[PDB]
Design a protein around this ligand. Structure first.
Ligand SMILES: N=C(N)NCCC[C@H](N)C(=O)NO
Ligand SMILES: [Zn+2]
Ligand SMILES: [Zn+2]
Ligand SMILES: [Zn+2]
Ligand SMILES: [Zn+2]
Lengths: 206, 206, 206, 206
């Protein structure tokens, strides 16, 4: 079975509800990796993401490279971001998404602390590259991002990276949902029991 | 449609002429990010890079993290570097490659300055790790450096980070050239007219 | 009659148990040079190395060059390390493995004191370089590290230097085991009564 | 095609005239790498070595790892040793043999200085392991030593590392000298305009 894991970073944002509506019409499940401050400011959308069948994961508190990796705060920020989400959805997620991917920031020491604290790490297999088209005419941008994604969809499992804080990304998800559904894909959320490694370190403990 | 951008950093140096011959024999173009100290010491090598169809960009004066980022000399140092390079080749190139990468050093202050100065910032999407392989037989090191590069070229555009100031790096270039070619890359150089963003801050202004 | 002596340094550590299993699966015996702080923290791992047919040697307390050599605490530290290990496994090992190798730390005075104290000193005849491969996917590093050891085993007795305190290192050992055994090596531990000299000073009193 | 390049280090010494007699007795030609202070002390042996058709090359002034490599004095000591030898044999040898081998002592920087100062660098392809048997019965010691050597002789050219300051090494030579004539080998000395690379770095500028 060819599965497509849509993943969404740095949320929630002002386009998130738009996106949740779009995904529901297509009976598509997804994963969100939320930043701490956005959880505080959008508790509703967070509750809604869970309620509508999507996995809710963490993406830290600061999204600051020096704190997370150089100063080794990764696991602490994931844990605090875990609390905020637990307070809303009533369960403590295990799946983290490292800001800026895990390579090279998540060294051998921190990778131990992630395993030792119960967390999994998921990077991705596809960069939609949606940030390139920021502040550009949404329509044209989005269809380009769909190209970025659709034409790299090759292997049975695919973990796609998108940012639902950007309009062109959210706008792209329509056209990505059609073309992937074509090539035999299914759009599921990440399931914690069904975990399989997807990380730049090929580190199978996460 | 696939294009690989070999980029060589910290040069020019005593191996740089050898690399220039290898590039020319294979009809391949690359990009060089130079430390001004070497611009001065090897001005003929700078002049030849530009003359053989390669891009000549800046990589600062001091290559000192503290001066560049903590003290905020990045844009200064890149313009000094720019001036020196112009005197030799007649162009004031706009592309900068930050020492130690942009993340975490190029903060938002400097990033604004970069844009207000009309400069451009390239990081990389493939790290050859070439300079680390310096405690082994050069040919064996070059094999492992090619292997790194060859097995990470997946995207239609790869910005491969190397350093022309180490023997194992230049020795690695032929295997690299041959491999990517079988995978379908061309080895164009950077063109300023065709700039597409490549940093770690996902800042598509630079 | 060819014999590979796998040696692991700076342990025990969080991957030592996994490595201990993997040795067991292949009936291979090895040698562990331990740091005193680690000996104190993982006492049961020490016991398990010993109880499984491995030689348990010393690698100082501080792994601090200036304290060991410029200050001459080498024999002191290896003696305290010996004391700590004996309390666990019942025997006072004699063999030490110098942090940073013996050249040039183990000066003549210290080499004399080594011999006066009944200690033996081993450096190695093959550097895996394993610990340098900590910025790449762990499988990939492990394959390069295997390649290193395999392509350098040519002498009837080879002492391979590794570190069991790194994931890529422990991941390299299976491919190292298979390979050397293709080349007809068997994997013994160090044996006190069968001591032969292996050091950079060519001092056959050690 | 058969060639065996016997090389002897750290000379001249007490047994060098014996060795020189042994080689002459077998029409064998060899290579000596001389330490500076031994050249000062044994001018006749140095003179005699050149006069009888063997190559005379340098092996440094101090034979000191930290001065040569860490403090970067290698080339200076080789040039100084070179002067001493020129003052006796009326030419300046190009071939140096690094104390302790070139790996990892001779880094990329020092390998440039050696290239630039006009010097070549020969390691070896066979370690006699002669130093193991020091202060042991010269008879048995030598026989073992011929064995280590003869055993690993299989490639068209061999560069054997021996030490003519040791009695067992010298005594071993008769047994080696036609252990190798049968296998085919002929015993030539090194000649500069016939130079081919034999170095642990596989650096072919050397
Ligand atoms: N100490 C270091 N080299 N830092 C690691 C990254 C260096 C960066 N690729 C660079 O400066 N390239 O020129
Ligand atoms: Zn993010
Ligand atoms: Zn640099
Ligand atoms: Zn160590
Ligand atoms: Zn020597």
């Amino acid at each position: 079975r060819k599965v497509a894991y849509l993943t969404f970073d740095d949320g929630p944002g002002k386009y998130t509800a738009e996106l949740l509506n779009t995904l529901k019409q297509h009976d598509a499940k997804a994963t969100f990796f939320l930043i701490g401050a956005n959880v505080k400011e959008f508790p509703d959308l967070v509750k809604r993401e869970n309620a509508e069948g999507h996995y809710v994961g963490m993406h830290s508190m600061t999204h600051n490279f020096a704190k997370l990796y150089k100063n080794g705060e990764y696991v602490n920020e994931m844990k605090e971001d875990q609390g905020l989400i637990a307070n809303i959805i009533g369960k403590s997620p295990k799946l983290t998404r490292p800001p800026y991917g895990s390579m090279p920031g998540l060294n051998e020491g921190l990778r131990n602390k992630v395993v030792e604290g119960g967390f999994k790490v998921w990077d991705w297999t596809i960069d939609s590259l949606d940030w390139r088209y920021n502040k550009m005419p949404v329509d044209a941008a989005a269809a380009q991002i769909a190209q970025n994604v659709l034409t790299n969809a090759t292997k049975p499992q695919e973990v796609i990276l998108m940012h639902d804080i950007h309009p062109q990304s959210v706008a792209a998800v329509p056209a990505i949902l059609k073309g992937l559904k074509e090539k035999g894909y299914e759009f599921e959320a990440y399931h914690e029991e069904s975990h399989f490694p997807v990380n730049f370190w090929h580190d199978n403990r996460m």
